Amino acid sequence: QTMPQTPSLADTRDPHMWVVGQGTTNQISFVIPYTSPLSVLPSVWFNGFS
Amino acid sequence: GVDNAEKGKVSDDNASTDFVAEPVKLPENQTRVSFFYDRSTLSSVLQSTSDVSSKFTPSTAKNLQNSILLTPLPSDIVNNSVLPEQERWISFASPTTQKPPYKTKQDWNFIMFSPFTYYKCDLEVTLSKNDRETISSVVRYVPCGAPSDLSDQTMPQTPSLADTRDPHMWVVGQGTTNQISFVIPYTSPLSVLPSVWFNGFSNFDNSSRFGVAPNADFGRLLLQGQGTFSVHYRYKKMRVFCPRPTVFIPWP
Amino acid sequence: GVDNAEKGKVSDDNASTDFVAEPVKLPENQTRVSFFYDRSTLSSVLQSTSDVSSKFTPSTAKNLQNSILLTPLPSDIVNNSVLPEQERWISFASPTTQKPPYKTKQDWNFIMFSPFTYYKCDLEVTLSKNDRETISSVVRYVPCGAPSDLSDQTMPQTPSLADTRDPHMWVVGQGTTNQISFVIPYTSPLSVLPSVWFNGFSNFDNSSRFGVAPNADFGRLLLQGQGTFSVHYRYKKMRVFCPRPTVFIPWP
Amino acid sequence: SDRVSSDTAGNTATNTQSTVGRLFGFGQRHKGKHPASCADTATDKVLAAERYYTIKLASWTKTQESFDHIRVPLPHALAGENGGVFSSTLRRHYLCKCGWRIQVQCNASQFHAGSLLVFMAPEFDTSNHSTEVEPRADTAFKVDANWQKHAQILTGHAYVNTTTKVNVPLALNHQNFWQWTTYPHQILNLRTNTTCDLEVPYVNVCPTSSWTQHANWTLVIAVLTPLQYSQGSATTIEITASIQPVKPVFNGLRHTVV
Amino acid sequence: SPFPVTVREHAGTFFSTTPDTTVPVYGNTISTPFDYMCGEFTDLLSLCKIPTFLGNLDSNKKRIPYFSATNSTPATPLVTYQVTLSCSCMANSMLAAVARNFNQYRGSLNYLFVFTGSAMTKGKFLISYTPPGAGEPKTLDQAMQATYAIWDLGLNSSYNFTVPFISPTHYRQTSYNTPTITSVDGWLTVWQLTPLTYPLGVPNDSHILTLVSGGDDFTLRMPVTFTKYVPQ
Amino acid sequence: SPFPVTVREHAGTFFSTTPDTTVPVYGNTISTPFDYMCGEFTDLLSLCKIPTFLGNLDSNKKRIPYFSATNSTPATPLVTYQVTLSCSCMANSMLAAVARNFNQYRGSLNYLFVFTGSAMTKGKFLISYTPPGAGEPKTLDQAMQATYAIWDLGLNSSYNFTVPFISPTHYRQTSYNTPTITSVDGWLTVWQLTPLTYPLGVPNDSHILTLVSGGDDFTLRMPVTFTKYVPQ
Amino acid sequence: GNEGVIINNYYSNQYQNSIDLSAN
Amino acid sequence: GNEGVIINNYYSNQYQNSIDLSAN
Amino acid sequence: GNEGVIINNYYSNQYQNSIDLSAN
Amino acid sequence: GNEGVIINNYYSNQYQNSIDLSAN
């Protein structure tokens, strides 16, 4: 943590979510874009090394 | 190909200049300053042990005050100041460990990456309660350089922070979601704010702390009610001026 | 340049009149009366120790009644009045300290800054519970000068305050957020309200308290249910008349 | 050839025979417009102040290492008596707004080796770093008398005693010199040129400057490659600079500062 | 069909300054007619422009709306006002009263001086405005090196002096904890150029009323609450 | 009439990156004018294109912005930079500083070399970019079999070398835990083709400044936070 | 003064606000 | 930058954002 | 596929969805 | 039957309701 008593995970510019309280409904949902540097992802096997 | 760096600038080439190649440019705009800084980053933490209906009194507890100075740069109690002021350096909270947390408040992401000398923007602030206990808090926003008004209650059992025309927020109850967010306009009397250093003094007898600009902030946030709250800053319509070096990183 | 103040008014000059200078005016409108007063300011506090389903009974506890007189000016129980009436002066709550809180209710910001003799506006009222315990309250709004109707319950186990056609609010449950807000129209039989003093009596035998105008308020708020609630006033479509002196401030 | 360049400013003129052109920081020039924050009509177009002020800066020896530098606070470097009418006018005005046209000079020979980085930087720390003492009016805006080492500024320099310094990892006056090249600059490569020409507009946190409290611009000369030469070659290698305030405008006439 | 909603993280928050309205609980009500009224004003700036009295110190440290002058020319200013809407000197002027509720100002300031001496009394004053940077002017030589106007007594009784808005920033703070270059803007000093002169049978001391107000291009912005205090 | 709503399952969640705004609590406020300003830039890519210094190792393992060359032609490269924006070699360049805050890059990289030797010193270097797959080039024979340019010293002092973007993927990672075929793209080695040659009275060692930056078609994307560290 | 909403008020103007009327 | 909403802002542009103005 | 809402998406298409682009 | 809403259904008709189709 760079500051006392703070969630270190929130100490970022990366997309992050924070839910808390009796007004909430105990869940979180969101959508993220495809971010892999690969054009398409292998669904089962990848016949090779990385 | 050949060039002369002493000119002050050389061409930005691609593979086609020296070799049998083609440009490979693809459209992209996530590098725009406005877009890059338009996202919430942890920038401060606040703590209060007094109830809502009471007189607000500046306090510190293990490096956490119950008020904040709105600025991405390091801020903290300086030389026993009543409220947090902008610092000129960062210090570890622990006198031993030589490891963070730091005792000073700031947007680490901004400090570690602010390749500009001046900046201009609006500030979207988010305040979140660190635990799930039902919130009951009052926050007062004071414009840049305006009176803090740390006065007594004028009426019994009322939050003194709410006893103002200054913008203030009041959240409480099991219907709430333990957080507060809002956006404030740039209120500093300065045209643009110094992002790193200010090579000068703030008063006419040059007795202030050299390096800190006068009124270089977005105001302050005073809080009352039980709890510890984390703060986020989001730089709206961010504009930067004069490119400058980034914070140095130790050699791997 | 020269002028004659005895005329009753002198010109508003800028640097160009006497010197080689230019006007430096920049557009600004945050000084407009309507805008300035169109914001919520703490103006009162209320306290009740009786449940919702019971008969409302006027009470006082350490200078806090369970009903309020809607007026920015000082109000409080006057000479053992059943309900709060408008005061003519402010008193400290403590008989010793010589320091606030005051025992009288008012919008400190309005009293300290009301450079006009008369005012006209609608009133946006905000009522907030001082702690996070689930709210369960009933509030009755009574138009300016209308019957208070402090009668018994006509039916068992019902909030007597709700037993009316008068505008009333009922908030309760963990789905709520412990507050209430609403706006009421100007209801006084007077065309405009005196903002500071009223140089006269309110009755034909001139026996009333000199200085207080008749029906110079926006009505009253009676509350039942457990808790202490702070009140805010927001002056909608605010209009002021006849400039007059501001409250004096001690010489620094 | 096309490297011969002359530049006139008032009753002064610089001349070079190895120029690599003039670099305009931010591609901008100070146009001399009056600050909209002042009602009084500014004093401007003072020919006696719009000239080049030349001063000796330092001696370059083999002992200097990469990134060792000399700082020239502006406008302060010229606020002294040698600032001529620019100075005498500046000292009698509350505010001043201006840009800078500068040429730093340094010659050696075809047999010498080494290079310098000449750049202009806004809000560049000019305070003394050889002490833990708070910078003061008479120690914060002075032209460096000695070459400044580089190590003590990478992470900044806190004005606190040596033992506290241990718990202070970073100070806002930090300067990652590895990127000093991002500032408007030019390079003085002994094999190529003996002069560098720069010009920057007016930048600051506000319309015009209360210069007595702030040195917004700093001219910096840092070595990039250490000076080298063999036995017999000239050993005295000095650095000079011609500084011209670009269209300075003054506001708030008053009695002089002391 | 019901609309899907995303409850923001600030649910239930009461924003004292939200630019939106709330629910009306007694609408369709007529606001008691007041068309007969006069004296309405819509901008608080109107008040700031009304010349109001400055508080000068009496020989017994009492506050008075004027200063004295006589048959002599002191080597020091008769009065000195630091240009700050925070000056204790203008603490009770309408200008300061209004400014206390705003964060920043910009524009001209008008210092009105009214000579109350006899019609037989003559004299000249040098009203000077010294911008900061070199400190307060110590002599007439220094004062007259800054912005100034010479006020000559005669038929017209008052002199309207304007402190030009000379600032490094477009706006300036109304108050401050410690003076900064954005909250303190110099001094206004009035000197005796020539001694007040008069015939026999005339009191030696003349009283000059002093007032302040915002000039023609004066503005305030950002509504705020000033440091509360106990009246007395 | 009231609108029926379906409260989604994420009620109250604070999304740090939601593309929406929040409630304004102090609107109708003017942003202090700054039209006089210069030096504004709107894209961080601008910074990436500014050539900045690489950190080479001194004989005492100290970091310097250049490398040495003399009257000889080593059988090994004078310097070797692995093409990764993660190279410790470019760790403090503006390019790397910016790239650390982004996930992927694409496009050309410019390696600028500036000869600082004397005007009397001559010589030729062979700057090579070896794509991966067969490991680092061990000899000049191997290096010149990949992409390369011969840099000849003379009137012009510097050489702008471009590392072509040769990749199996359209984008490449900025950093990594372990090197992968999408985060490491080969090496840039500079060899001494002919020895640095010069007359008497000239120091044997010449210093070549080394810098990097993104090329004309260089881009970065996906804003992120890099692994935090303690300054020192 | 402090009216910064794009969409019109949900409540009628006669209900949201007091009705201003001239007696002449 | 990070403005991805189809419907216009509920709050006026003068309230949602700081008002940019040129002094010249 | 599973797009059954009458009113348009509240978020821009460039934000709600990944931006598809051809390298040729 | 029991369809008393002015504004159109938020969900497509093909999603809100079963799709009726004739096999002939």
PDB file of C-alpha atoms in Angstrom, chain C residues 8-78:
ATOM      1  CA  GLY C   8     -25.769  60.467  -2.669  1.00  0.00           C
ATOM      2  CA  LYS C   9     -23.788  58.557  -5.275  1.00  0.00           C
ATOM      3  CA  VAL C  10     -20.481  58.768  -7.119  1.00  0.00           C
ATOM      4  CA  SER C  11     -19.304  57.059 -10.306  1.00  0.00           C
ATOM      5  CA  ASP C  12     -18.014  53.477 -10.398  1.00  0.00           C
ATOM      6  CA  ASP C  13     -14.615  53.940 -12.021  1.00  0.00           C
ATOM      7  CA  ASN C  14     -11.995  51.609 -13.413  1.00  0.00           C
ATOM      8  CA  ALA C  15      -8.275  52.256 -13.936  1.00  0.00           C
ATOM      9  CA  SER C  16      -8.818  54.081 -17.256  1.00  0.00           C
ATOM     10  CA  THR C  17     -10.438  57.162 -15.685  1.00  0.00           C
ATOM     11  CA  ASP C  18      -7.307  58.530 -13.986  1.00  0.00           C
ATOM     12  CA  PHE C  19      -4.553  56.434 -15.545  1.00  0.00           C
ATOM     13  CA  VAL C  20      -3.320  54.926 -18.785  1.00  0.00           C
ATOM     14  CA  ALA C  21      -5.163  51.655 -18.293  1.00  0.00           C
ATOM     15  CA  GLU C  22      -7.879  49.413 -19.698  1.00  0.00           C
ATOM     16  CA  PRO C  23     -11.030  47.868 -18.217  1.00  0.00           C
ATOM     17  CA  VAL C  24     -10.330  44.289 -17.164  1.00  0.00           C
ATOM     18  CA  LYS C  25     -13.890  42.977 -16.757  1.00  0.00           C
ATOM     19  CA  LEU C  26     -14.546  39.249 -17.195  1.00  0.00           C
ATOM     20  CA  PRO C  27     -18.052  37.752 -17.361  1.00  0.00           C
ATOM     21  CA  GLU C  28     -19.298  36.339 -14.064  1.00  0.00           C
ATOM     22  CA  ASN C  29     -22.714  35.597 -12.612  1.00  0.00           C
ATOM     23  CA  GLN C  30     -22.191  33.627  -9.403  1.00  0.00           C
ATOM     24  CA  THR C  31     -22.981  36.872  -7.587  1.00  0.00           C
ATOM     25  CA  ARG C  32     -26.627  36.846  -8.705  1.00  0.00           C
ATOM     26  CA  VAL C  33     -28.963  36.769  -5.712  1.00  0.00           C
ATOM     27  CA  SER C  34     -30.951  33.809  -7.053  1.00  0.00           C
ATOM     28  CA  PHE C  35     -27.816  31.732  -7.635  1.00  0.00           C
ATOM     29  CA  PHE C  36     -26.123  32.687  -4.367  1.00  0.00           C
ATOM     30  CA  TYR C  37     -29.076  31.655  -2.187  1.00  0.00           C
ATOM     31  CA  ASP C  38     -30.024  28.636  -4.283  1.00  0.00           C
ATOM     32  CA  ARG C  39     -28.087  26.134  -2.170  1.00  0.00           C
ATOM     33  CA  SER C  40     -28.836  24.213   1.016  1.00  0.00           C
ATOM     34  CA  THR C  41     -27.577  25.645   4.305  1.00  0.00           C
ATOM     35  CA  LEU C  42     -28.043  24.203   7.807  1.00  0.00           C
ATOM     36  CA  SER C  43     -30.899  26.149   9.370  1.00  0.00           C
ATOM     37  CA  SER C  44     -32.446  24.060  12.132  1.00  0.00           C
ATOM     38  CA  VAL C  45     -32.414  20.871  14.203  1.00  0.00           C
ATOM     39  CA  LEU C  46     -35.282  18.731  15.469  1.00  0.00           C
ATOM     40  CA  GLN C  47     -35.598  16.002  18.127  1.00  0.00           C
ATOM     41  CA  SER C  48     -38.259  13.442  19.035  1.00  0.00           C
ATOM     42  CA  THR C  49     -38.407  10.662  21.633  1.00  0.00           C
ATOM     43  CA  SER C  50     -41.910   9.394  20.863  1.00  0.00           C
ATOM     44  CA  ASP C  51     -42.746   6.655  18.352  1.00  0.00           C
ATOM     45  CA  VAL C  52     -44.585   7.008  15.065  1.00  0.00           C
ATOM     46  CA  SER C  53     -47.821   5.388  16.238  1.00  0.00           C
ATOM     47  CA  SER C  54     -48.580   7.771  19.106  1.00  0.00           C
ATOM     48  CA  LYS C  55     -50.078  11.186  19.820  1.00  0.00           C
ATOM     49  CA  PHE C  56     -47.775  14.074  18.974  1.00  0.00           C
ATOM     50  CA  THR C  57     -47.086  16.268  21.993  1.00  0.00           C
ATOM     51  CA  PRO C  58     -44.930  19.442  21.936  1.00  0.00           C
ATOM     52  CA  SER C  59     -41.720  18.836  23.876  1.00  0.00           C
ATOM     53  CA  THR C  60     -38.324  20.405  24.559  1.00  0.00           C
ATOM     54  CA  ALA C  61     -35.098  18.675  25.542  1.00  0.00           C
ATOM     55  CA  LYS C  62     -31.866  20.602  25.986  1.00  0.00           C
ATOM     56  CA  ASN C  63     -33.106  23.346  23.660  1.00  0.00           C
ATOM     57  CA  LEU C  64     -34.468  21.017  20.981  1.00  0.00           C
ATOM     58  CA  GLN C  65     -38.182  20.839  20.227  1.00  0.00           C
ATOM     59  CA  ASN C  66     -39.961  18.172  18.183  1.00  0.00           C
ATOM     60  CA  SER C  67     -41.445  20.826  15.886  1.00  0.00           C
ATOM     61  CA  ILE C  68     -39.905  23.694  13.908  1.00  0.00           C
ATOM     62  CA  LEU C  69     -40.918  27.157  12.693  1.00  0.00           C
ATOM     63  CA  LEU C  70     -39.844  27.491   9.062  1.00  0.00           C
ATOM     64  CA  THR C  71     -37.923  30.766   8.903  1.00  0.00           C
ATOM     65  CA  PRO C  72     -34.240  31.598   8.357  1.00  0.00           C
ATOM     66  CA  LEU C  73     -34.496  34.122  11.207  1.00  0.00           C
ATOM     67  CA  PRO C  74     -33.964  33.083  14.860  1.00  0.00           C
ATOM     68  CA  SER C  75     -36.854  31.043  16.256  1.00  0.00           C
ATOM     69  CA  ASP C  76     -37.347  29.305  19.600  1.00  0.00           C
ATOM     70  CA  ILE C  77     -39.861  28.827  22.400  1.00  0.00           C
ATOM     71  CA  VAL C  78     -40.720  32.393  23.384  1.00  0.00           C
TER      72      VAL C  78
END
